[PDB]
DNA sequence: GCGATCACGT
DNA sequence: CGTACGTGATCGCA
């Protein structure tokens, strides 16, 4: 049983408690808090939010760093409280992060899923209480209050066994010194938001919409017909049935119309280049112009992403609603979208710092490949050096095409090395890609050794680890299905690289946050994009930041090779280039 | 409401 | 069939 409390009392403010600050809306920014549960040594309590969040003693308890709280997904609550002007401190255990570190592949997304990991089932899944999608709703107080108290009681019961397993995994410091401090930094980042120049976006959208009508009309005059270009159904019967274009690859139901295939088809018909142009314009228009404008808060012209900290299998963050980690930059037309991301105050600038080749530097260090480490010690262009070695030529003999292919091997080697994906990527045969690999491994024998040894260790231990002891279990490494096994071997090779890079930038974020506060700087972290950090700061702080941010990022860990950080600043995200 | 394509990023 | 890891939009079916 539990107390359905009318007012806050002192026994609810013990210095240790499991706390539930329930925000049911998926996007928690400026979202309602529907209820609160506290379990401590004195009892189990449900508090209505409009009561507890108005009680200065409860608010003081929330904000006291010496009163320790155990929670599930504290960042959700922390941010929902930030929007009410209330500080959340003292969160010493986050069950969501603890479950994520113990096994990311469980997809642990609620308290019930995490409790099942320890044979605790006295709590319902959120989706069983709230419903799914359309039918989603907050239930009556008795049903809500029992759910929140069952979640708090589970967190209370589950902290010792999770912490015990984290300790056995040598992951206790990972949780307490990396992921939980990082949760607080991400909350500040999401709450700060990023300013959007919405007239610029709107003006871009009208230009795209003009160029989309023109290209659309050209596609119809080239097909002799009107049809929905956005549908691979109709597009396939225009291209491969009406126009008789060669079918270079079939999908499951019909024909494939990837940009992979269409570029091969361009010699045969003028329609193909126009379809490709239509698709690129439509992507910007749909995902990045209209998509962004839909999530901008009209009162502040800011977007407030949500960083999913417990989702990827490698330890990367992900970014939702909006995804600020896939804003275009490769092609110039779409890169202009970054002009609409601006500082949130006058006379501030955007500052962006990015690791140079962090994955291949981590691999140099992890593999202790003499040739790879020396390449980075000499600060070589790694793709050109790899080409010199694979093709056995001097620097001046590296053609652009050789460097492009050596680059593809290098991006392949970070992924699962297997040829078919390189052969597909380089539009070559398996037979030829295989010999690319063989010549790479003759040049970097320590990488070869590391790739053999890590697959062997994944089979022996059942998991691979990153630099800071993140793990990923790989049960498919023993499968007798060749596809399933190969996927697990590729993950065994990639995950210590991709995941160690993720560890490093997360530690840098923590180190950067500490330094900016020590230095009393107004600069604020806004975004992380896997290997870059994006800040905004007063114009008067740029010179100091040029020295500070790269140093902190470069010194986050000490590897057998240097870490290298490039950085740029400008009046928009675009100009920070 | 829900897989399958497709395309955007690192 | 497979390059690694994500998110979002569109379509099409039931």
XYZ file of C-alpha atoms in Angstrom, chain A:
577
model
C 0.000 0.000 0.000
C 0.921 3.656 -0.326
C -0.189 7.046 0.935
C -2.233 9.158 -1.473
C -0.940 12.373 0.014
C -2.916 15.619 0.249
C 0.069 17.727 1.289
C 3.839 17.332 1.457
C 5.165 16.146 4.835
C 8.715 15.889 6.196
C 8.853 12.131 5.923
C 8.610 12.518 2.148
C 11.869 14.504 2.111
C 14.326 11.870 3.287
C 17.913 12.114 2.018
C 17.460 8.957 -0.078
C 14.415 8.164 -2.219
C 13.267 6.609 -5.437
C 11.517 9.446 -7.264
C 9.017 9.354 -10.130
C 8.200 12.655 -11.827
C 5.908 11.352 -14.514
C 5.775 13.025 -17.920
C 3.624 11.000 -20.283
C 3.869 13.118 -23.434
C 6.597 11.599 -25.596
C 8.161 15.002 -26.227
C 8.710 16.242 -22.690
C 9.602 19.881 -23.505
C 7.157 22.194 -21.704
C 5.061 19.065 -21.067
C 2.683 18.324 -18.176
C 3.898 16.455 -15.131
C 0.947 14.174 -14.401
C 1.961 12.811 -11.015
C 4.768 12.186 -8.563
C 5.757 9.186 -6.464
C 8.346 8.979 -3.680
C 9.523 5.759 -1.996
C 11.955 6.077 0.898
C 12.677 4.452 4.249
C 9.464 5.963 5.691
C 6.876 4.950 3.097
C 5.451 5.200 -0.399
C 3.723 8.419 -1.365
C 1.760 9.716 -4.318
C 1.682 13.493 -4.681
C -0.438 15.435 -7.115
C 1.902 17.690 -9.145
C 0.036 20.975 -8.647
C 0.402 20.390 -4.909
C 4.010 19.227 -4.633
C 5.462 21.542 -7.266
C 3.955 24.515 -5.383
C 5.361 23.458 -1.995
C 8.654 25.289 -1.338
C 9.924 22.476 0.869
C 9.363 19.830 -1.792
C 10.928 22.107 -4.409
C 13.859 22.696 -2.082
C 14.149 18.930 -1.619
C 14.124 18.433 -5.403
C 16.953 20.901 -5.771
C 19.122 19.777 -2.866
C 22.158 17.903 -4.222
C 22.645 16.246 -0.818
C 19.228 14.532 -0.939
C 19.848 11.517 -3.152
C 17.224 10.341 -5.656
C 16.979 7.122 -7.637
C 15.063 7.500 -10.884
C 14.338 6.070 -14.312
C 15.097 8.528 -17.178
C 15.935 11.477 -14.944
C 16.624 13.712 -17.968
C 12.963 13.570 -18.964
C 11.945 14.772 -15.505
C 14.817 17.227 -15.168
C 13.831 18.936 -18.419
C 10.099 18.975 -17.698
C 10.943 20.650 -14.407
C 13.349 23.100 -16.097
C 10.350 24.292 -18.103
C 8.557 25.015 -14.814
C 11.602 26.857 -13.456
C 12.463 24.074 -10.979
C 15.899 22.515 -10.526
C 16.393 18.770 -10.117
C 19.572 17.791 -8.271
C 20.875 14.820 -6.331
C 20.025 12.094 -8.863
C 22.621 9.459 -7.878
C 21.154 6.478 -9.742
C 19.394 6.389 -13.131
C 17.927 2.941 -13.785
C 17.481 3.676 -17.485
C 21.194 4.404 -17.959
C 22.110 1.499 -15.717
C 20.001 -0.938 -17.742
C 21.335 0.514 -21.003
C 24.952 0.032 -19.932
C 24.340 -3.519 -18.729
C 22.865 -4.562 -22.072
C 21.818 -2.014 -24.723
C 20.155 -4.720 -26.787
C 17.283 -5.211 -24.364
C 15.724 -2.027 -25.751
C 14.945 -1.159 -22.136
C 12.554 1.753 -22.452
C 10.505 1.561 -19.290
C 10.826 0.575 -15.681
C 9.034 -2.724 -16.298
C 11.477 -3.795 -19.008
C 14.396 -3.021 -16.733
C 12.844 -4.828 -13.739
C 12.307 -7.954 -15.820
C 16.107 -8.093 -16.142
C 16.210 -8.879 -12.392
C 13.097 -11.095 -12.185
C 10.969 -8.242 -10.803
C 7.579 -8.081 -12.481
C 5.449 -6.201 -9.917
C 5.074 -3.194 -12.209
C 3.242 -2.739 -15.477
C 4.762 -1.557 -18.761
C 3.936 2.097 -19.371
C 2.237 1.133 -22.645
C -0.175 -1.137 -20.769
C -1.203 1.803 -18.554
C -1.223 4.718 -20.988
C -2.254 2.866 -24.148
C -0.527 3.147 -27.502
C -0.675 5.986 -30.024
C -4.214 7.162 -30.732
C -5.844 5.618 -27.628
C -2.984 7.083 -25.518
C -4.267 8.831 -22.401
C -3.585 9.391 -18.710
C -5.861 7.155 -16.594
C -7.826 8.088 -13.474
C -5.844 8.976 -10.350
C -6.211 5.597 -8.535
C -4.831 3.752 -11.553
C -2.186 6.382 -12.229
C -1.094 6.527 -8.577
C -0.686 2.761 -8.311
C 1.456 2.740 -11.461
C 3.761 5.536 -10.334
C 4.219 4.002 -6.891
C 4.907 0.570 -8.407
C 7.550 2.218 -10.611
C 9.120 3.963 -7.614
C 9.049 0.753 -5.557
C 10.767 -1.074 -8.439
C 13.511 1.561 -8.715
C 13.981 1.334 -4.938
C 14.289 -2.463 -5.121
C 16.399 -2.546 -8.288
C 19.231 -0.126 -7.478
C 21.360 -2.555 -5.460
C 21.247 -5.461 -7.985
C 21.874 -3.204 -10.979
C 24.769 -1.471 -9.206
C 26.127 -4.904 -8.215
C 26.151 -6.098 -11.830
C 27.596 -2.793 -13.047
C 30.416 -3.243 -10.527
C 31.031 -6.815 -11.674
C 31.164 -5.496 -15.257
C 33.616 -2.749 -14.172
C 30.920 -0.351 -15.369
C 30.162 1.400 -12.064
C 32.300 4.434 -12.928
C 30.950 4.516 -16.494
C 27.506 5.075 -15.030
C 28.342 7.408 -12.192
C 31.133 9.427 -13.794
C 30.149 9.495 -17.484
C 26.520 8.712 -18.338
C 24.808 10.329 -15.342
C 26.852 13.584 -15.516
C 26.250 13.536 -19.263
C 22.458 13.275 -18.721
C 22.553 16.574 -16.858
C 24.588 18.214 -19.619
C 22.217 16.954 -22.319
C 19.239 18.276 -20.332
C 20.785 21.768 -20.295
C 21.502 21.468 -24.022
C 17.988 20.397 -25.010
C 16.405 22.997 -22.745
C 18.572 25.742 -24.237
C 17.410 24.763 -27.722
C 18.803 26.118 -30.997
C 17.532 29.342 -32.617
C 15.977 28.969 -36.062
C 15.765 31.795 -38.611
C 12.284 30.880 -39.729
C 11.855 33.517 -42.410
C 14.995 32.214 -44.032
C 13.623 28.672 -43.881
C 10.258 29.888 -45.188
C 11.948 31.773 -48.011
C 14.006 28.702 -48.859
C 10.825 26.629 -48.868
C 9.192 28.892 -51.440
C 12.277 28.684 -53.671
C 12.416 24.884 -53.430
C 8.681 24.724 -54.124
C 9.244 26.767 -57.286
C 12.108 24.547 -58.463
C 10.041 21.475 -57.560
C 7.177 22.535 -59.844
C 9.569 23.128 -62.734
C 11.367 19.800 -62.351
C 8.068 17.997 -61.761
C 6.650 19.400 -65.001
C 9.849 18.365 -66.820
C 9.444 14.798 -65.540
C 5.917 14.595 -66.955
C 6.945 16.008 -70.337
C 9.743 13.405 -70.285
C 7.475 10.530 -69.261
C 4.639 11.712 -71.497
C 2.431 11.218 -68.467
C 1.452 12.480 -65.034
C 2.040 10.157 -62.074
C 3.188 10.417 -58.468
C 6.974 10.607 -58.596
C 7.229 10.130 -54.805
C 5.873 6.573 -55.141
C 8.350 3.810 -56.090
C 5.282 1.923 -57.401
C 4.382 4.311 -60.230
C 8.022 5.340 -60.734
C 8.966 1.736 -61.484
C 6.308 1.289 -64.162
C 7.289 4.578 -65.804
C 10.993 3.685 -65.815
C 11.102 -0.086 -66.227
C 7.804 -0.714 -68.019
C 6.884 2.348 -70.092
C 10.379 3.716 -70.762
C 11.888 0.205 -70.950
C 14.928 1.144 -68.870
C 17.214 -1.779 -67.915
C 16.303 -3.329 -64.560
C 19.676 -3.387 -62.808
C 18.265 -4.562 -59.454
C 14.836 -5.732 -58.233
C 13.272 -5.041 -54.847
C 11.051 -7.558 -53.047
C 7.739 -6.459 -54.592
C 8.923 -4.690 -57.753
C 11.957 -2.813 -59.058
C 14.556 -0.783 -57.179
C 14.773 2.985 -57.737
C 17.602 3.873 -55.381
C 19.909 6.743 -56.288
C 22.458 3.923 -56.567
C 20.529 2.461 -59.502
C 19.275 5.694 -61.070
C 22.760 7.146 -61.556
C 23.658 4.027 -63.562
C 20.467 4.591 -65.583
C 21.141 8.260 -66.456
C 22.840 7.537 -69.843
C 19.627 5.957 -71.178
C 17.102 8.730 -70.588
C 16.890 12.412 -69.618
C 14.131 11.606 -67.126
C 16.561 9.995 -64.693
C 18.636 13.090 -63.885
C 15.368 14.987 -63.366
C 14.022 12.292 -60.992
C 17.291 12.560 -59.049
C 17.000 16.345 -58.931
C 13.343 16.087 -57.928
C 14.281 13.688 -55.109
C 17.020 15.896 -53.661
C 14.788 19.001 -53.706
C 11.887 17.023 -52.277
C 14.080 15.715 -49.455
C 15.062 19.230 -48.356
C 11.492 20.481 -48.763
C 9.817 17.653 -46.894
C 12.264 16.618 -44.175
C 14.217 19.837 -43.592
C 12.090 22.862 -44.530
C 8.564 21.751 -43.643
C 9.891 19.253 -41.101
C 11.868 21.826 -39.128
C 9.164 24.483 -39.272
C 6.732 21.980 -37.753
C 8.822 21.585 -34.569
C 9.999 25.175 -34.052
C 8.396 26.751 -30.990
C 6.575 29.807 -32.401
C 7.185 31.841 -29.227
C 10.982 31.525 -29.222
C 11.832 30.304 -32.755
C 13.971 27.611 -31.099
C 13.986 23.879 -31.738
C 14.442 21.654 -28.686
C 15.730 18.269 -29.758
C 15.632 15.266 -27.453
C 18.864 13.295 -27.179
C 18.154 9.632 -26.732
C 20.978 8.616 -24.411
C 19.954 4.966 -23.948
C 19.178 3.775 -27.469
C 22.056 3.038 -29.853
C 23.943 -0.235 -29.663
C 27.341 1.499 -29.775
C 26.873 4.246 -27.197
C 26.245 7.028 -29.685
C 23.563 9.530 -28.868
C 20.581 9.871 -31.127
C 18.550 13.024 -31.751
C 14.773 13.252 -32.224
C 12.011 15.776 -32.931
C 13.975 17.256 -34.690
C 16.944 15.106 -35.576
C 19.641 17.752 -35.477
C 22.334 15.211 -36.326
C 21.428 14.665 -40.005
C 21.171 18.289 -41.242
C 22.594 18.351 -44.805
C 26.163 19.422 -45.424
C 27.587 17.274 -48.235
C 25.868 18.934 -51.177
C 25.888 22.721 -51.208
C 22.190 23.150 -52.047
C 21.118 21.356 -48.871
C 23.989 22.671 -46.787
C 22.402 26.112 -47.088
C 19.746 24.849 -44.638
C 22.382 25.454 -41.968
C 22.097 29.185 -42.584
C 18.816 29.069 -40.625
C 20.562 27.903 -37.430
C 21.724 31.059 -35.707
C 22.903 32.161 -32.245
C 20.139 32.707 -29.735
C 21.345 36.213 -28.770
C 22.606 39.236 -30.667
C 26.407 39.489 -31.034
C 26.886 35.796 -30.363
C 28.425 33.319 -32.780
C 28.197 29.617 -33.504
C 31.410 27.732 -32.669
C 31.874 24.131 -33.881
C 34.731 21.797 -33.092
C 35.157 18.382 -34.632
C 37.515 15.451 -34.174
C 39.649 14.659 -37.200
C 39.362 10.929 -38.032
C 38.605 9.913 -34.470
C 37.531 6.394 -35.502
C 40.732 5.582 -37.390
C 42.778 7.171 -34.592
C 40.993 4.960 -32.026
C 41.657 1.963 -34.302
C 45.364 2.875 -34.556
C 45.446 2.935 -30.773
C 43.319 -0.195 -30.191
C 45.183 -2.280 -32.779
C 48.641 -0.822 -32.036
C 49.322 -1.029 -35.749
C 52.790 0.500 -36.135
C 52.115 1.834 -39.625
C 48.715 3.299 -38.720
C 49.987 4.947 -35.538
C 52.939 6.467 -37.354
C 50.649 7.853 -40.046
C 48.726 9.776 -37.372
C 51.913 10.721 -35.504
C 53.040 12.349 -38.762
C 49.543 13.890 -39.130
C 49.300 12.477 -42.649
C 46.267 12.662 -44.871
C 45.171 9.161 -43.931
C 43.309 8.391 -47.145
C 46.331 9.369 -49.244
C 48.700 7.375 -47.043
C 46.413 4.347 -47.250
C 46.439 4.692 -51.061
C 50.228 4.894 -51.166
C 50.372 1.655 -49.225
C 47.632 -0.338 -50.979
C 48.754 0.628 -54.477
C 52.492 0.823 -53.624
C 53.088 4.302 -55.026
C 54.580 7.564 -53.836
C 52.459 10.527 -52.800
C 52.695 12.240 -56.201
C 51.467 9.077 -57.947
C 48.169 9.011 -56.018
C 45.434 9.790 -58.462
C 42.143 11.227 -57.222
C 40.511 7.875 -58.025
C 43.087 5.939 -56.006
C 42.501 8.204 -53.032
C 38.727 7.819 -53.397
C 39.031 4.041 -53.363
C 41.465 4.066 -50.457
C 38.946 6.236 -48.603
C 36.239 3.638 -49.266
C 38.468 0.882 -47.880
C 39.067 3.045 -44.801
C 35.382 3.633 -44.182
C 34.837 -0.048 -44.880
C 37.519 -1.159 -42.431
C 35.796 0.788 -39.634
C 32.598 -1.008 -40.516
C 32.662 -4.766 -40.921
C 35.481 -5.266 -43.408
C 33.626 -7.881 -45.541
C 34.052 -7.391 -49.299
C 30.508 -7.419 -50.802
C 29.688 -4.121 -49.100
C 32.949 -2.625 -50.315
C 32.397 -4.243 -53.722
C 28.899 -2.735 -53.742
C 30.181 0.621 -52.531
C 33.005 0.813 -55.073
C 30.836 -0.640 -57.889
C 33.428 -3.383 -58.392
C 33.429 -7.161 -58.190
C 33.816 -9.203 -55.012
C 36.968 -10.712 -56.518
C 38.562 -7.257 -56.833
C 37.370 -5.893 -53.473
C 38.814 -8.974 -51.738
C 42.248 -8.061 -53.022
C 41.869 -4.471 -51.843
C 41.346 -5.905 -48.356
C 44.271 -8.292 -48.690
C 46.568 -5.436 -49.660
C 45.236 -3.261 -46.855
C 46.016 -6.009 -44.350
C 49.541 -6.452 -45.705
C 50.086 -2.724 -45.128
C 48.411 -2.625 -41.703
C 49.108 -6.087 -40.233
C 48.222 -4.858 -36.741
C 44.735 -3.988 -37.923
C 44.439 -7.491 -39.361
C 45.584 -8.996 -36.059
C 43.120 -6.808 -34.164
C 40.228 -7.814 -36.431
C 40.999 -11.527 -36.014
C 41.569 -11.182 -32.276
C 38.432 -9.186 -31.509
C 36.188 -11.636 -33.344
C 37.881 -14.400 -31.372
C 37.353 -12.503 -28.099
C 33.712 -11.830 -28.960
C 33.217 -15.605 -29.291
C 35.113 -16.405 -26.072
C 33.575 -13.780 -23.771
C 30.302 -13.286 -25.604
C 30.697 -9.498 -25.841
C 33.082 -6.766 -26.948
C 33.928 -3.683 -24.930
C 34.882 -0.106 -25.569
C 37.684 1.961 -24.101
C 35.541 3.023 -21.135
C 34.032 -0.472 -20.613
C 30.779 -0.074 -22.515
C 29.741 -3.501 -23.738
C 27.705 -5.065 -26.510
C 26.732 -8.732 -26.347
C 27.047 -10.581 -29.659
C 25.170 -13.900 -29.420
C 25.042 -14.227 -33.211
C 28.838 -14.574 -33.371
C 28.340 -18.360 -33.046
C 25.436 -18.693 -35.506
C 25.767 -21.195 -38.349
C 23.823 -18.898 -40.659
C 26.585 -17.180 -42.649
C 24.664 -13.916 -42.900
C 23.800 -13.768 -39.200
C 27.351 -14.685 -38.158
C 28.907 -12.156 -40.528
C 26.748 -9.370 -39.123
C 27.954 -10.251 -35.610
C 31.583 -10.311 -36.716
C 31.213 -6.904 -38.353
C 29.694 -5.596 -35.132
C 32.538 -7.155 -33.167
C 34.994 -5.181 -35.276
C 33.101 -1.870 -35.476
C 31.645 -1.561 -32.005
C 34.914 -1.039 -30.040
C 35.868 1.631 -32.589
C 32.554 3.477 -32.987
C 31.773 3.022 -29.290
C 35.177 4.172 -28.032
C 34.814 7.318 -30.158
C 31.415 7.811 -28.516
C 33.018 7.385 -25.077
C 35.664 9.955 -25.904
C 33.343 12.684 -27.101
C 31.055 12.115 -24.078
C 33.982 12.561 -21.694
C 35.029 15.663 -23.633
C 31.541 17.112 -23.181
C 31.806 16.612 -19.415
C 35.304 18.069 -19.356
C 34.199 21.011 -21.524
C 31.196 21.757 -19.299
C 33.418 21.809 -16.217
C 35.989 24.064 -17.902
C 33.443 26.574 -19.207
C 32.090 26.964 -15.674
C 35.576 27.289 -14.120
C 36.336 29.962 -16.702
C 33.014 31.747 -16.080
C 32.297 31.680 -19.818
C 28.842 32.340 -21.216
C 29.460 29.890 -24.066
C 26.963 27.058 -24.020
C 26.972 23.640 -25.595
C 24.107 23.243 -28.044
C 24.581 20.074 -30.071
C 26.704 16.998 -30.356
C 26.914 15.291 -33.761
C 28.873 12.094 -32.970
C 32.332 13.616 -33.397
C 31.634 17.369 -33.351
C 30.444 19.704 -30.601
C 28.525 22.873 -31.509
C 28.429 25.835 -29.108
C 27.108 29.359 -29.112
C 28.991 32.083 -27.298
C 29.427 35.863 -27.220
C 31.619 37.249 -29.976
C 34.056 38.338 -27.233
C 34.610 34.718 -26.146
C 35.682 33.236 -29.501
C 39.429 33.758 -29.105
C 39.412 32.031 -25.726
C 37.173 29.239 -27.046
C 39.516 28.633 -29.996
C 42.170 27.681 -27.455
C 39.967 26.051 -24.827
C 37.559 23.813 -26.740
C 40.141 22.001 -28.914
C 42.460 21.477 -25.919
C 39.709 19.951 -23.789
C 38.541 17.750 -26.658
C 42.093 16.690 -27.542
C 42.962 15.870 -23.907
C 39.781 13.981 -22.990
C 41.680 10.677 -23.185
C 45.346 9.912 -23.823
C 45.834 7.503 -26.747
C 48.954 6.075 -28.386
C 48.218 8.572 -31.166
C 47.366 12.273 -30.824
C 43.832 13.487 -30.938
C 43.214 16.307 -33.395
C 40.385 18.805 -33.294
C 39.472 21.308 -36.004
C 37.161 24.174 -35.188
C 35.421 27.031 -36.958
C 33.058 29.803 -36.029
C 30.628 32.081 -37.784
C 27.353 33.920 -37.545
C 25.361 30.809 -38.513
C 25.937 27.074 -38.351
C 26.629 27.223 -42.095
C 29.416 29.773 -41.655
C 31.006 27.684 -38.878
C 32.915 25.905 -41.662
